[model samples]
Target: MILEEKDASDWIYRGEGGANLVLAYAGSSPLFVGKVIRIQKARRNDSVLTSDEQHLWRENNELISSPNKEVLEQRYVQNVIIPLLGPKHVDAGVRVSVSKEFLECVDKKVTKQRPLWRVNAANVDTSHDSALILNDHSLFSGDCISVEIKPKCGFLPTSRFIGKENMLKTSVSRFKMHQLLKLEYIEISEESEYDPLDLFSGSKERVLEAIKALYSTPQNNFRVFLNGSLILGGESTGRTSPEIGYAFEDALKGFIQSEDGHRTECFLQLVSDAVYGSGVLDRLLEIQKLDKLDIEGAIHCYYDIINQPCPICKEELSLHALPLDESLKIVKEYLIAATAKDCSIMISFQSRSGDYVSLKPTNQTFDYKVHFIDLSLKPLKRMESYYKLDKKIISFYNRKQKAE
Candidate 1:
């Protein structure tokens, strides 16, 4: 159905990212009862995809031929990602037409709620006629609490394609390497203790340790929501401070079983149990490992895709010496790998009523639903930045080690 002016007020801003604005339905319409509308944001200018993007995704004829960016996103998820990642947790989501007035009105309504920097960088793209509607993962069932964990790359690269200069990547995780860079930029207060390896590890104690690390530094990596409202994490100061932990502990009043000071421990335990039992990360890790070239090697292939002179062989002529078809395939898979690397995992838990797994540590039996979010297609143009950043992270780590 078309959303017009009056319907604009029915959606509330949930959150946003570099790509789109998400709004939870506030009206009681049966169709949108428990749904959120994802509206695309415009940085004063945008395009669905350039010829280069179309060429990269040419294998998916439908995706390459989409009329607009909105349609491109849906098709990319269905045609490219869902098949690779599996469909149990993702919904490409249905599209609904939104009027110009509806877009403008909704933009105005959420203006004050949005971060100032976000508003300055970009605002709602009123030019679009449609938005994606997907289920709000946070609001599941029975005072449901959802834990969103962005478990970055779990496995270190063993690809023979790695370079000698970048061999550190084979040992240190890209997540850990990037943390130092993030701290340097002041994006994070500290280096996170959570290791993707431990979280992805099949062991119980290691998983618990990983969860506690995430709880300690919830800086966008981990967030807990109670009944669709955030209890911890997101845009708050002192994310790493024990103050948030105590605030989070107090918020767990009815949901957690442990006594006052101890509830936080049990809550982390419950999250650890749910994560380990779901086994979703195992599949996610597989998709993430698709970066067979490890960006170091992938950059050479990316240059081949663009028919540009290899700066990185001027970069490599061995991988560069491959067939054009193989070059295309390398870059394609690399972009897919980028998506898996950046995606977030949302695990929602409800009461024990359903026939679901139980949390042994807390003695709190509960039903858990695991879903993946932020699985958007990465732009092919990002290949250069990916290579450069990978280099920056490794170099910084090396310098710090030498100084120490």
Candidate 2:
């Protein structure tokens, strides 16, 4: 609709035969994450080949080679896209593969099987290749890679994790089960990558139900430990933190400013759909576009507000932080809006483990033990080692610099 300069920022690699692709990055803005950057050996156009430089073929007419289009798509997304954005953060893509038969098949199989909100394909590269660059139109927005990498989670699951369940967990137990898998993988696998949804992919309705359970149960286990101490944590039952409150304010404001009444209504409905579909066992929180809230602009403010002082140490925990509540809210809202608009959205969630007993950072016997371990050991150990090594290296090199 409103194809702005921002639209240029959203590039979908629909071509096949593996070429080096770059995404533009803006150097000056923190939000831009650098502009139009390229990843070498990027994906090939995954669309089917036309009749040897002839026109692209249709779906019902019979596939050129691979019967399942997903075969090509899988190759490109996994081999090419993953290297560009890394496995954890890269979300959705645009498809250029549109043929008479292909469109019909996509309309049937993709919508029925994968269940994405939208499937748009207008481009037809007759000379080069015929490929469809389909993506789940719900969860991904911008092209930056964002991941919540928790070493505490045991081992990440395989079996193609894109679905409703892992994206929206319902209980501390479910969250923990996923977490255990993540941690286990980190411990054992030297090279492991995960799609946020990889933990959920059984049935869409079932996962949605799981999400319902989570919202209903509402665990204080949705806690945050900072610098080896329990700094900020809360149950879904209580009012959110000031940071969360502020973030919510921004989110609501952003949504109102960015979209209209119809879009807003769809946004709310999409969230409801995800919640109901997740089938989680928790009291789901209702979401709506408040008349006063503008979600987009508010998202910026919400993050700035939430990532304030550490509740435990009263010190700022940096790393380009944002308020957890506002950040999560922004993500949740985006998920719904993208899904509604049939735009590509990627969804993922982080939690302790089922084997995890509790989330008490003070007590070592809980599901959140690894998170505590991360807070206590990993970063600090790395920091201490870094400082000590730096001191030695600097001492050795200091006199050399002066002498030179």
Candidate 3:
């Protein structure tokens, strides 16, 4: 796929991550409209390892010192994840190389500052990462349409990281449930009024409130669009919003008519049942187990790479000061809990022939399809990244407790 620097300005901003930038071709463009172009940052030489990553390299001497991001990500998606998740739901994606000039222009337009990791690595300049062209999430046509919902990862059953036995049971139980849910483009708006994070705050009341608010606010719940430009749910321009009423209640009413017709409660229960029954999280947990991911060792190696003391070890805290076997137990518990929390699966329904209103289930045939997205790989040998992350989480709760 080729995109020129002159036309780069016309590409509408979609969203971005630490590694790449995402933009959409405007409808007016002769080429594909609504088709997304994911551009890797120019300075992101995935083949090169920074000083911090070198420590991880030392531990995983068996691993390739430098890996090509293009090949690595594609391989994981195609060879590893697709087999488990199935081909119907997942797309391995097509790789595309972009010009340095084009990336620089997008970089300047998005942010002047380099990625925090690059700056932390003491690099004066940032370079391009990698790019891919993929079908937009709403890859449907004709009367059939799509609606995407991004549910929190660990919506399945799981106890907190209380003990090895409990965590193992939780992990095993998650797989047993075998549930899947439908699943962002990007956030251009500053300071979203509602934070999805609140849903996982571990409070029943907070979770219910968050769910209610998500459906009530279409901007935060689901997005439906296929014409490329027009979209329903979040903000769209040169695009029409949902022609029919666009609300969680409306979608649920279309999905199934309630016996007594408690649409709100029934809808909530429908989501819970679909999510718990889908079995997506079980597969993810099983993958981690099969890989024998050494999360604890990876965490320790990460801090060494970053030249930072492990906060728990630094404090001489005995919490993580267990023997290797015991440490592995604790880390496994943490990983299962964290994995359940981090992952997201999306579900989409389509109508064979009709306007967007056809998404809801009619009396005749309940024609619909389901799939998964964003099933990213856990770092093979380096989980020290999570150590730093967990420290911040602990800190956040500590501050919240003090405030209370």
Candidate 4:
């Protein structure tokens, strides 16, 4: 595999979905060329001089600063690097000094008008910009297999201490503040390998050994991998399991049939073909019809409709209703067509005060469910072994540029 021009800013595109390109390197130098599910670093903060940061020294002693730059030896391309590297590799990409409103909000949350594939974002403006991505090695598949993440693999840091400190034990490492506010990811690729302290360690014996390794690896990306890794390491008094509550009462036990003929019209046309095909099910039914409970089942209410609430309110009953990103692009295309093919389902609900409780489909206390948010076959064999190793390394650099 010979691709130069410095292998187009250190490759790691990975698209065709399941998301990738989580770069944050400098130390592990693009793992010499690939296969890095995760490697951490680059935690720049100033988040306007940090707030949950105790007014970070009162916003750094009241402003007037510049030339300040540290935490850069970058990489953080997780979840939505153009739906894991598509748009013909963001049209042979390059997105260095990011920020055109975070690359047009990652192209309107990953390529507008998407249908099974829609992710575009262009780049290449480095100048110490930690190589932003997508360089078309002819739209991947020359035996494309590259998974570089080895820059201090599986790190968990957050150091912030300056000298002459009067008793400075200085802290920051809830696994580096859950990778700076981490969002969705608990992947457990095959055979005994599920650990995010087994579901974020408050050490209740490591959250009961990560809820007994989520009921002994009931697969499908490790069954919502312990509620998306302990809801990103915070407030988890209960986290679903009983084998994801008997696999959501067996995919909603034939939709509680009292006979709606033809099996409830084939389960409402399989929930309207996964919320009109992978638009994320109207953002998972407006995050399961949220009602003032922050992450309180924002989108984890398998089925909790105790009358009222569903008077078709896609917005405005306060608690700031739901359905934002076009209802999370139709609940991520109806939970990827109800857990993507060879299915599995789990349901749970309980909202208390607002009246919406019915958790006992074998109550594993809302078994943090996600039976099979489909898009599988190991992400289509890791995008067919990453475009068959990027077509055997761009045909060995096009026969070494025709023997130069």
Candidate 5:
């Protein structure tokens, strides 16, 4: 494969995570422009394991001890998720190798202390590119305003439960939202610090406040971009409020207005309806009960991600201490909770006459796109992993209460 030669000037740094350094190619090539490229760092796909990693898997009697990480991720996305979510929205990635110059340039742009690989848009001159880039455009337009949503764990958008049953319920709800609503959302694939049981207050006002609070931080998992420029939530996430609710309302303003004129009361509810409808979650749960997936290995994978010892493994001092049927139930519940927290949606609006706009129910003049990004597979959790997660949740809440 021909390695693409790009200067730090040619590539605008978007964000960075443990696995990949994401950049927006700003050159004249129409094929690359407006499209983001994710460059791999130290992160490998979960299915890919080192020799030592494979040895550990073999010790545990895990099934997918395959050496190929790329193939594993590809197959999982192609076979498991694509059928359920459809191909139009999911990004089947194209791999590209970069010149050393590109990496060096990116290095200089990032801080030495925290630098692995990342660049700031401010340091690059995108104006010199063959085509001019727009900074105030819609997500699917000449340029876009993109935001990544990675909801915190233990905080279900729909349910208040944080136990085993809540996990099962949330998983089904996630599939229903993905399949029925045609909304773009990604699944959680790893472990992180964002989990907290009391992130939301369960009240309307406080829940919305929690939602707003999330928008305050920019994470590799959560970001907002305008015309390929980082306007909100990048390496310096939580620097400023993106005013997401205002932006959302403005984008959907025309759609929200009626003959009665601008029904503000129902706008949030409408979005909620679009996210999930009446009886859909219940029906999804019903279907899930009828057709359960045995994901015991995935459960074990979750424990590995969190770096915790598996409870079942430790208690029985053996892998088979947990019965297959019981193991399936435990894993299924974990998947549900993980899904609710780990997905993201990119809502693109139409930019015409230099005005950023969203689609209305009747308006044909403007166009929009909602592409789901970052819907990766989750590693399964062992019993002790859940217990550790629970303790973390309770500890945070207790600290919060004392601070209050």
Candidate 6:
């Protein structure tokens, strides 16, 4: 489990999230190939789980009692989520011990690829001494392609807690509604047309349509990786460049044996075939349903858990409630549901392999593996921010509806 200085050169910068920096193994070592390392990031004003989380996740004995954040994440996933999500798609990851010298050596190497803002604001956690290693879903069976989709909440919130003013919340998905908000913030050039409901509809034709939509408007929701190298989606923001899409359409090459124009169509069909054929999404949807109560309802329970006055009720002081133990369970499950909703599904396709699945549209047979990614533990403190953002999303949607 020890990664020494000699091993530093083999790990290359892959990516980063809010809390960790990732590097993919590039060496010929038998154990290292097809693996990615997740290293915690250090920020100037960084923080960890608060006392609330310690108390909240206390239900799991060792989870609240873990020695470090990395262990906490591993345990949370292994102990908390695995039983519910099933052990198939989830990888709790292997902990590898890293020395300060090893960390510093690799930290300097990754600066070239890191987002400049990310570089200035944070660096690898030098104070820490270990990293999490997991199979690189981007790479599968030597020379195959992978599609990683950050499919946000599939089901729209349907709770009486959602007032009539925001009735559209019951129909329009959180992802679809957020696209307009992202457009308002100039976060994207155009609002994405992809709908989660279409992908989750479980209808082959509709699933094909959804993949087509994802292909057209990739934003961050969709990405195409050929033979473990990024072809369709590039780094930072993941918005496809005008030229990149053209390059990707041509990148299919031998994978989809069709005319230049039709390769894209075959590729889309291939992706849709694997997606609908795999029962992963349905299982994921059930985990997402852990959010039995929407944020509108969960907010009240959050206030009750913290034993604070309800701000939403203050707008009108009379309030309603969930029992203390039940309140913890609801908010706890809501946060877990948030992780499931926010996570991505990485499905890799390999051609002409063992135990294969058949693609009807392309009349091609292939091997595909479905792995879930980015299932980080949500901070319990986010309960307040979740409520605020829910309010913001619903209000914006309401205002836009009135304008139309």
For all the candidates, what are their Cα RMSDs to the real structure? Answer: 2.2, 24.3, 9.6, 25.2, 10.8, 2.5
lDDT of each: 0.82, 0.28, 0.44, 0.26, 0.41, 0.81
Shift of residue 330 alpha carbon in model 3, Å: 11
Name the best candidate (by TM-score).
1
- Candidate 1 ranges beyond 4 A from true positions: 44-47, 235-237, 353-355
1-404 per-residue lDDT for model 2 (tens digits) = 22233333343321111122222322344433322212222123333333421112222132245443333334434443344334443422333322344323322322322212112222222232233232221212222111112211211222121123332222222234333443444422211222223224345554344333322222322222121122222211243445654443343332223333232232223333432343321211111121012221233333343344322222323312555544444433432222221111222221223332221222222111110000100111122233344234333334334577
Of the two candidates 3 and 4, the one with more favorable lDDT, higher being better, is 3
Instruction: For candidate 5, write residues 40-84 as lDDT tens digits.
Output: 443222235444334333323322443344344444555545555
lDDT of 3: 0.44
Which model, 2 or 3, shows the larger TM-score?
A: 3
Compute each candidate's TM-score over C-alphas: 0.93, 0.22, 0.55, 0.20, 0.53, 0.92
Pairs in steric clash, model 6: none
Q: How should the candidates be ordered by lDDT, best one leading?
A: 1, 6, 3, 5, 2, 4
C-alpha root-mean-square deviation, candidate 5: 10.8
lDDT string for model 4 (154-254, tens) is 11222221122311112322222222222223222233323433233333444345334433443322222111111111111123445545454344333
Query: Would you list the clashing residue pairs of candidate 1?
Result: 312-315, 313-316
Q: How does candidate 4 fare on TM-score? A: 0.20
Worst 10 residues of 4 by lDDT: 145-154
The local lDDT score (0 to 100) that residue 112 gets in candidate 6 is 90
